[PDB]
Swiss-Prot record, chains A, B:
A GO term from the CC aspect: late endosome membrane
Region annotated Important for association with membranes, chain positions: 80-143
Domain comment quoted from the record: The C-terminal domain interacts with lipid membranes containing acidic phosphoinositides and is required for location at the midbody.
Name of the coding gene: MITD1
Keyword vocabulary terms for this entry: Cell cycle, Cell division, Endosome, Membrane, Transport
Substitution effect: R143E: Strongly reduces binding to membranes
Localisation: Late endosome membrane; Midbody; Membrane
The organism of origin for this protein: Homo sapiens (Human)
Name listed for the protein in its UniProt record: MIT domain-containing protein 1
Length: 155, 155
């Protein structure tokens, strides 16, 4: 069932993952699935980390990530980054399962309460900060966004 | 008036600035003063930025920072970073006033509503993250702390 459509306008703020996922996430959620072909660059690896921080801060014990393995220069940090996130989650009693596919195109987030969130840009919807010390560098509610569509579904 | 003493134990979590300053910061606060000799290094400048993000997200219009200039070459990066924070604040309609003193030793945060918060380590009370991609790297509520005392005062 298609439940809602949220339009994130160009340069819009108030879209941290905490703000965006709020309505669909509650204490009953114990398992999460994320399909995103673009978790390779530093900022994309940190976006996934912040998504995991939100889920554990909330009773998630299992996170599944389906992504594409980087073929080039990003491969080393992508591997080191994803293994570090998995080890940090393990230390929190959380299982992270990473699967790779070069044939993935869909961007989909699924919670075991039945909610599904499809973002056009996946988790990678923020613009680069104006500077190294600009407001919104750390608090993503103050970070301007790229124009994107968020589609909400329920099982 | 000395109001309360909060002991931050070694390796304690749940101490982001948002969590720590919650009880003393409300819609009525329009002006903030911070005295901290250690707003020099990249991590200390980011600490100050996250403190400003919290105040701006509340109707704070004026922020005063009294700090110490680093004695060495690090002063170039501290001065540049502080100017970047001031320009980002300016763009948000917020005035940041930075003053430097080689004779300041006290750590004191003052809100216009009468509340005063003195942290032993100032804003710089977090431990280094376990790894580059560990939970708590971005969300400070998951970041382990150094042992410190927080003293609360009211005018
Ligand atoms: Cl976020
Ligand atoms: Cl970023
Ligand atoms: Cl913080
Ligand atoms: Cl009060
Ligand atoms: Cl840090």
């Amino acid at each position: 069932h298609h439940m809602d459509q949220i339009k994130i306008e160009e340069n819009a703020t108030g879209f941290s993952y905490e703000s965006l996922f709020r309505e669909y996430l509650n204490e009953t959620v114990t398992e999460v699935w994320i399909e995103d072909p673009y978790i390779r660059h530093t900022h994309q690896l940190y976006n996934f980390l912040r998504f995991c921080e939100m889920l554990i801060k909330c009773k998630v014990k299992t996170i599944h990530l389906l992504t594409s393995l980087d073929e080039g220069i990003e491969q080393v940090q992508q591997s080191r980054g994803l293994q570090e996130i998995e080890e940090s989650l393990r230390s929190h009693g959380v299982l992270l399962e990473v699967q790779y596919s070069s044939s993935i195109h869909d961007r989909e987030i699924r919670f075991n309460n039945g909610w599904m969130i499809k973002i056009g840009r996946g988790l990678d919807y923020f613009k680069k900060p104006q500077s190294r010390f600009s407001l919104g560098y750390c608090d993503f509610d103050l970070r301007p966004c790229h124009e994107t569509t968020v589609d909400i579904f329920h099982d």
